[PDB]
Design a protein around this ligand. Structure first.
Ligand SMILES: [K+]
Ligand SMILES: [K+]
Ligand SMILES: [K+]
Ligand SMILES: [K+]
Ligand SMILES: [Mg+2]
Ligand SMILES: [Mg+2]
Ligand SMILES: [Mg+2]
Ligand SMILES: [Mg+2]
Ligand SMILES: [Mg+2]
Ligand SMILES: [Mg+2]
Ligand SMILES: [Mg+2]
Ligand SMILES: [Mg+2]
Ligand SMILES: [Mg+2]
Ligand SMILES: [Mg+2]
Ligand SMILES: [Mg+2]
Ligand SMILES: [Mg+2]
Ligand SMILES: [Mg+2]
Ligand SMILES: [Mg+2]
Ligand SMILES: [Mg+2]
Ligand SMILES: [Mg+2]
Ligand SMILES: [Mg+2]
Ligand SMILES: [Zn+2]
Ligand SMILES: [Zn+2]
Lengths: 202, 25, 91, 127, 97, 212, 97
RNA sequence: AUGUUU
RNA sequence: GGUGAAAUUCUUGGAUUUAUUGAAGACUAACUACUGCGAAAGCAUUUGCCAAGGACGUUUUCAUUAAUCAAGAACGAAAGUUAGGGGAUCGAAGAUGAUCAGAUACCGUCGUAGUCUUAACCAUAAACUAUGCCGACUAGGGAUCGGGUGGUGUUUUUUUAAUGACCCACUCGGCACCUUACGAGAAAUCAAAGUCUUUGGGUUCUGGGGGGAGUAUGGUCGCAAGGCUGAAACUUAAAGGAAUUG
């Protein structure tokens, strides 16, 4: 509930005690029930397997990636998202990766990831079409909907409130050094207006 | 006049006629 | 007979929400309500549960997929590229 | 039994560069251009300015300790000209007559495998 | 090709279609070859291979699924495994491997 | 007014170990100082010198050789093979109309660890009694010739170290091997190994670097 | 009227030929229509062959040449006199001088 | 390099 | 830098140039041609896979199953549209520098959409050979592409030969070309634009002086831009084609 991507319940055997250990993975696309998932340094490069980032070749597509070895997955967890392995630095062992936002990150080569892309992709391509569907979407996430515009408020309620016309009145780009109660609008905006041209600055 | 530019001017004129006809009802 | 000329499944929305939004919803609704071939038993019995879950009515096998279709093009590309990388690593 | 640099004559239009470097190329010696030796904004590519610049570069190379130069001559290349400018020939001539020894003249103009659609539009410069 | 040989067997020789009849033919020892679809469940595939190992019967692995195997044998229904009882006038049993 | 060449000291590029001759020239670098080491400024320089200079014979006027400085020892830069390339003039001279240009390239690993890309070129030629004026190949001949050349390059590398391949390129025995293996497909007048490109180096291993 | 029997180009049996850009003005002209001239110039003539032979450290260098295939549009070729306007009968003469 | 109309 | 010359712009925060690297996206130079394939639009790095195709060979098979085709379908450059990805370059718009009498034109520097890709539209080009398709026949010639046939042929290795490449001759199909034109045309020119007043091999489509006008209106298709269909009033003695002399 509240998550775009489906979850996979993978049952492992406890290596030190006779019992079963169930894990809640984020299902990668193509993973099916009854499938054998192999997790570890020596696992094969198959979709759904959990491998350290250093053990996979350049160009590999991984998901649920650990920022640090052992944090059990931090990156590329939302539906349809993935991390691209773009290179390795075996001396001072590190892996260069491309994050879903397009940022290039250097991660420890012992950090683990799941081979494949998170399931549920293309979810945001369908128009919600209804306040009701937005209502039920956020009914299981948090009380962040609906959103009243600040310009529609009174000056007491918001920096944008008040005026004989609904207007901001001053620049909506707010400094990063501003304080709580001031950071309404575009916080630390490097630019504004419609984005024209190429992204992914380098 | 160039045939191409006469065609362009006529196309703009039809666009204007369509707009005015849509305005009218 | 053909009950609707073009709206199809999106006739349930009447005249609301805009024609472009209704068409965008129509494509993906057809995709998500279609039946798909089971890769395991070979029957056209795979239907969506929640988004990303695709279950075969016969053989009761469930596969992770796209939100509105069994396999997205990105996932197919990833599968082929991992096949290639695995084959290069093993040989 | 000589000490060899690399001449590196980039003879574009609008300018000529006489850039003698070490054999590796990382360390340079007295890169002088036609615009440094003439101030007219149009004789920068002239053979005379190229000759003066090459003579100055040769004098500085002889003071540094360079006796011979392996010649690498280029045009703008890329997608623009592929034709060496009017000043590169005079620059090489002046390098030859300034007492420096010459070796291994080569054209290193950057030539693509049909990349980088050229500037000017499909109708070109309509002069 | 293999599909042509299989068509010849269906046209002239003797055959059975399906897991149950294939296993019955294997256990009676009147099976000369079993063709197993690519998408056969691996447990069923292993059981058929074990029966074939016990009966000294040849196994051919059809590259297509049950849909393609049914088409190759000329039926409108899925066939997961085919058993050849008599080859008829067909070279399927000898021109393999 | 600082005259930066007054603080620059010269080094001798004792570049090759096996080509013909130790000495290929000199290069100047900033004198070793507190926070900027002269060997640090060196050890990455790639010098491109003609194989004719390296051998002393003028029949190697093309085929410039790259030599990358691997280790610095006492006013002597020890380099190693970094790549080979034809000269632009020679390449353009070989490329002519009314004939078919065939190119092959492979990415192969030398016996020890060196990853190289080898680019070989060849051109169709007329027979002795040919009256037809162009002598083009039928592109199935081109596919076969490319396969033969690629196999020859792939097996010539992977069976030789970097030093062995370097010592094999100078006599151009690979060109003659390609001619022998392709004479039954097309005459192929101008077979050459036009380029060798280094893609990946093994661990430095100054011990086996010490062949010069 | 039709000025040239085939056309002002060389294209019969193709339909489309990829264009090239004029070296002088960068106009896009089909590759077959463009006036193509080869330059095989000596890398040094410059009244300087003797000068650089003397200055060379290599005896009998046999200095190389520069090769450059120039593609001209029709307007640029005519303006630069690479190609000249010929008489009606002389136009049907494809032999170079 | 720029030069309109009759 | 850039130009005819300049200017805008960048530059001792080291621009331009040099070397070693790295990333991105596009493109596929030279080879490249009066060469190839495709129904056309088009298609040019390698290799692998997937189907397809012409020609040739054929003492294989069927036996009229065919040709052209209203309605109807499929594809259809570029530009443009929708939504993602991508966005190096160039670059409608836009901004600027100059020129000019004015010059938000040509020229210079940037630069949005676009250019690329995926999933859908759009369905138009001087979409041209301004030459419908099928069939037969009527001059000569040499090339060239693909296939085949022959040689006491040349070279190449396997050891007999054999393919491979080449030479010679023939041959079928193709892209074209040169000469001549009995012939055709108003001529330019044309091996078809010939076999047409000595007028009939089959068949589809289109035009009927120039404008108004591919306009108005209606229909239909399209998200839109627009496409397809498509007048009339009125006006006019020419408009136009080819060639000749100035
Ligand atoms: K709101
Ligand atoms: K306010
Ligand atoms: K200049
Ligand atoms: K762009
Ligand atoms: Mg909102
Ligand atoms: Mg209020
Ligand atoms: Mg307040
Ligand atoms: Mg405020
Ligand atoms: Mg109010
Ligand atoms: Mg002009
Ligand atoms: Mg004319
Ligand atoms: Mg065309
Ligand atoms: Mg008058
Ligand atoms: Mg190419
Ligand atoms: Mg060809
Ligand atoms: Mg029709
Ligand atoms: Mg298009
Ligand atoms: Mg039309
Ligand atoms: Mg037409
Ligand atoms: Mg009329
Ligand atoms: Mg006229
Ligand atoms: Zn199933
Ligand atoms: Zn031009």
């Amino acid at each position: 509930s509240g998550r775009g991507a489906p979850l996979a319940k993978v049952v492992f055997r406890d290596p030190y005690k006779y019992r079963l250990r169930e894990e809640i993975f984020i299902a990668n696309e193509g993973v099916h029930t009854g499938q054998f998932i192999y997790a570890g340094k020596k696992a094969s490069l198959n979709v759904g397997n959990v491998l350290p980032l250093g053990s996979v070749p350049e160009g590999t597509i991984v998901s649920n990636v650990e920022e640090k070895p052992g944090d059990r997955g931090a990156l590329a967890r939302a539906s349809g998202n993935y991390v691209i392995i773009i290179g390795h630095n075996p001396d001072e062992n590190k892996t260069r990766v491309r994050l879903p936002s397009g940022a290039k990150k250097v991660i420890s080569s012992d950090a683990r990831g799941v081979i494949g892309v998170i399931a549920g992709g293309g979810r945001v391509d369908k128009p919600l079409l209804k306040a009701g569907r937005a209502f039920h979407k956020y009914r299981l996430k948090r009380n962040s909907w609906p959103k009243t515009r600040g310009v529609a408020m009174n000056p007491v309620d918001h920096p944008h409130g008040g005026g004989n016309h609904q207007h901001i009145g001053k620049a909506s780009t707010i400094s990063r050094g501003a304080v709580s109660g001031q950071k309404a609008g575009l916080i630390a905006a490097r630019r504004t207006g419609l984005l024209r041209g190429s992204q992914k600055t380098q | 006049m160039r045939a191409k530019w006469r065609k362009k001017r006529t196309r703009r004129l039809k666009r204007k006629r369509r707009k005015v006809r849509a305005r009218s009802k | 007979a053909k009950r609707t000329k073009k709206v199809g499944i999106t006739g349930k929305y009447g005249v609301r929400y805009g024609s472009s939004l209704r068409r965008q919803v129509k494509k993906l609704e057809i995709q998500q309500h279609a039946r798909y071939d089971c890769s395991f038993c070979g029957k056209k019995t795979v239907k969506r549960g929640a988004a990303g879950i695709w279950t075969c009515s016969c053989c009761k096998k469930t596969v992770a997929g796209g939100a509105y279709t069994v396999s997205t093009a990105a996932a197919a590309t990833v599968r082929s590229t991992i096949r290639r990388l695995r084959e290069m690593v093993e040989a | 039994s000589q000490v060899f640099g690399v001449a590196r004559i980039y003879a574009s239009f609008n300018d000529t560069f006489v850039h003698v470097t070490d054999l590796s190329g990382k360390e340079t010696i007295a890169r002088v251009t036609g615009g440094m030796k003439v101030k007219a904004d149009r004789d920068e590519s002239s053979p005379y300015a190229a000759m003066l610049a090459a003579q100055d570069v040769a004098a500085k190379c002889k003071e540094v300790g360079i006796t011979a130069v392996h010649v690498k001559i280029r045009a703008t290349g890329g997608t623009r000209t592929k034709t060496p400018g009017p000043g590169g020939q005079a620059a090489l001539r002046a390098l030859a007559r300034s007492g420096l020894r010459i070796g291994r003249i080569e054209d290193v103009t950057p030539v693509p495998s049909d990349s980088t659609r050229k500037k000017g539009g499909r109708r070109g410069r309509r002069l | 090709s293999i599909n042509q040989k299989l068509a010849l067997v269906i046209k002239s020789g003797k055959y059975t279609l399906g897991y149950k009849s294939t296993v019955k033919s294997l256990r009676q020892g009147k099976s000369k070859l079993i063709i197993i679809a690519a998408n056969t469940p691996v447990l069923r595939k292993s059981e058929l291979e074990y029966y074939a190992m016990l009966s000294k019967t040849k196994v051919y692995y059809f590259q297509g699924g049950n849909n393609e195997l049914g088409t190759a044998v000329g039926k409108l229904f899925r066939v997961g495994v085919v058993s050849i009882l008599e080859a008829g006038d067909s070279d399927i049993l000898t021109t393999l491997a | 007014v600082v005259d930066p060449f007054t603080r620059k000291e010269w080094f001798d590029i004792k570049a090759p170990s096996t080509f013909e001759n130790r000495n290929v020239g000199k290069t100047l670098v900033n004198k070793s100082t507190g926070l900027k080491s002269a060997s640090d400024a060196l050890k990455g320089r790639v010098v491109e010198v003609c194989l004719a200079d390296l051998q002393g014979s003028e029949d190697h006027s093309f085929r410039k050789i790259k030599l990358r400085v691997d280790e610095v020892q006492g006013k002597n830069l020890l380099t190693n093979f970094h790549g080979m390339d034809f000269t632009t003039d020679k390449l353009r001279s070989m490329v002519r109309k009314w004939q078919t240009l065939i190119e092959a390239n492979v990415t192969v690993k030398t016996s020890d660890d060196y990853v190289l890309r080898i680019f070989a070129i060849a051109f169709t030629r007329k027979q002795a009694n040919q009256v037809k004026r162009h002598s083009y190949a039928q592109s199935s001949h081109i596919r076969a010739i490319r396969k033969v050349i690629s196999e020859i390059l792939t097996k010539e590398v992977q069976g030789s170290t970097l030093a062995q391949l370097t010592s094999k390129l100078i006599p151009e025995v690979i060109n003659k091997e390609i001619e022998n293996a392709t004479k039954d497909i097309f005459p192929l007048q101008n077979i050459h190994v036009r380029k060798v490109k280094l893609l990946k180096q093994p661990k430095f291993d100054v011990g086996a670097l010490m062949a010069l | 009227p039709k000025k040239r029997a085939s056309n002002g180009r060389n294209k019969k049996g193709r339909g489309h030929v990829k264009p090239v850009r004029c070296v002088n003005c960068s106009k896009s002209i089909p590759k077959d229509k463009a006036i193509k001239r080869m330059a095989i110039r000596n890398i040094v003539e410059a009244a300087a062959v003797r000068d650089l032979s003397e200055a060379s450290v290599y005896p009998e260098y046999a200095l190389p040449k520069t090769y450059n295939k120039l593609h001209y549009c029709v307007s640029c070729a005519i303006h630069a006199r690479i190609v000249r306007v010929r008489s009606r009968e002389d136009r049907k003469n494809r032999a170079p001088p």
